From a paper:
[name] is one of the major import receptors in the translocase of the outer membrane (TOM) complex that recognizes and mediates the translocation of mitochondrial preproteins from the cytosol into the mitochondria in a chaperone-dependent manner. It contains an N-terminal transmembrane domain and tetratricopeptide repeat (TPR) motifs in its cytosolic segment. The C-terminal TPR motifs recognize the internal mitochondrial targeting signals (MTSs) of preproteins, and the N-terminal TPR clamp domain serves as a docking site for multichaperone complexes that contain preprotein. In line with this, the mitochondrial outer membrane protein [name] (encoded by [name]) is a high-confidence interactor of [name] in both [name]-CoV-1 and [name]-CoV-2 interaction maps, and it acts as a host-dependency factor for [name]-CoV-2.
Further, upon coexpression in bacterial cells, we were able to copurify the [name]-[name] protein complex, which indicates a stable complex. Using cryo-EM, we obtained a 3-Å structure of a region of [name] binding to the active site of [name]. Obtained cryo-EM density allowed us to build atomic models for residues 109 to 600 of human [name] and residues 39 to 76 of [name]-CoV-2 [name]. [name] makes extensive hydrophobic interactions at the pocket on [name] that have been implicated in its binding to MTS, with the total buried surface area at the interface being quite extensive—~2000 Å2. In addition to the mostly hydrophobic interface, four salt bridges further stabilize the interaction. On interaction with [name], the interacting helices on [name] move inward to tightly wrap around [name] as compared with previously crystallized yeast [name] homologs. Notably, we found that [name] is in a markedly different conformation than previously visualized. Furthermore, we had previously identified two infection-driven phosphorylation sites on [name], S50 and S53 (17), which map to the region on [name] buried deep in the [name] binding pocket (yellow). S53 contributes two hydrogen bonds to the interaction with [name] in this overall hydrophobic region.
Author numbering:
A (entry chain B): 39 to 76
B (entry chain A): 109 to 272, 298 to 600
Amino acid sequence: PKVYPIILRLGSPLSLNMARKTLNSLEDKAFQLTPIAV
Amino acid sequence: NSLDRAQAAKNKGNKYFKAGKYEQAIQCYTEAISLCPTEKNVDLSTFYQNRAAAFEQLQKWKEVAQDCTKAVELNPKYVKALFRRAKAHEKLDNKKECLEDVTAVCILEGFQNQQSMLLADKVLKLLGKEKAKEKYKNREPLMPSPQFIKSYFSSFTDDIISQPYLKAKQYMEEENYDKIISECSKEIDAEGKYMAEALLLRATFYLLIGNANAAKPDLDKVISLKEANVKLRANALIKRGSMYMQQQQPLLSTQDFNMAADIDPQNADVYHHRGQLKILLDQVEEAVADFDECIRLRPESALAQAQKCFALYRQAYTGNNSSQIQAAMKGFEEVIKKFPRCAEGYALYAQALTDQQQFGKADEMYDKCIDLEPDNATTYVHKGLLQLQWKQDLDRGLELISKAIEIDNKCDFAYETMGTIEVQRGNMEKAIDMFNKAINLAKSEMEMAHLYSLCDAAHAQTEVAKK
């Protein structure tokens, strides 16, 4: 797959940092899964 | 004759192109273009794209560009001409025109061809960084949410700043946060009784505001100053080690995080912030060992036991051992029954469940977090992002994240998320507005460069929608 920088939030709950690490993948699919592209 | 002479002239181009005789090849393609029977609707676009290929070998990037444009005007879905024109744009530093041509190519290839995808990603990163550095020079020093600052300082146990600068401490406990920098700046230029730690309180609020360039001299002084409490020296190395990670300098970051554990070996905050970093770098085995050292120093802590359990889940999950993955899953319920008010136990467990596709159980764990803390806006965001995975029901995904934005209008994770929903709905103008609302809450160039890649892909699909 793609590789992204480790964009730390400062002193945040580890669940929030693991959530930003996930949203990068939903952003990747969002531009392929859209009506303009289909 | 009429078609045959043009086809012959194309192959007379091909023989000279194979010979590397590129001028003679261009003359034969120019013969084909002159000889073509346009009244028969011959596919003249192919002669122009063939002519354009030879001008890459001569590296006349304006000529390959304009001969691809001739092919595209005759034949608007011809992928070879669009991709060759994109490469020519990149060489001419026409990055925006490259992005629009590669966006059309990705769409017309169904995103399958990874040569197109690599050029899109590179050009988006360069466009991203150029927009990011010019905005980041001009940003507001925007103070984050009070819920965020209280959650932040609740991460540091073994720290003279958090536990109880002497003027500044009043405004921390009264939450007048925008005063803190001003007091620390006059408690420096005084005796070490104030100065030696006013530096580190000031350096902490520069980091919270995203002003990392102003943080680095106040940290560098605190390391260099010999008489200051060893726990400030260790705490400053956590904050320098983190600053280097925003700069993506992992070797310099690692050197500081090791010096902290050499300098003050009986300090939980050093192993806590090392543990949280090592598990984001996916160096999982070092994270488990540093979280275990947090429990050794804080055995009564609910958070330390939640975190070590998530680290053993990530260790099993970077493996593929089903027995170890299932053992780690039960480990979160053992944490929850021991610590039934541990909100981060439910949030981390919900993410292990989310990741194991157990969406309906994960959703209940996010409800339990709302019962335990109604002010936690990010749970409505983790519940909204769950909808985007839980058979993608985008309609109610908006409603959840709208409620999240209403609880805390500074949650940049909420705006960035709802931007991707508006993208999946095709509503690109409102997606770009959501990403702009996230950009106005970024803390670094590294974050703005990522959000501007999203705006530029949304613009490029808006321009391809016309074509």
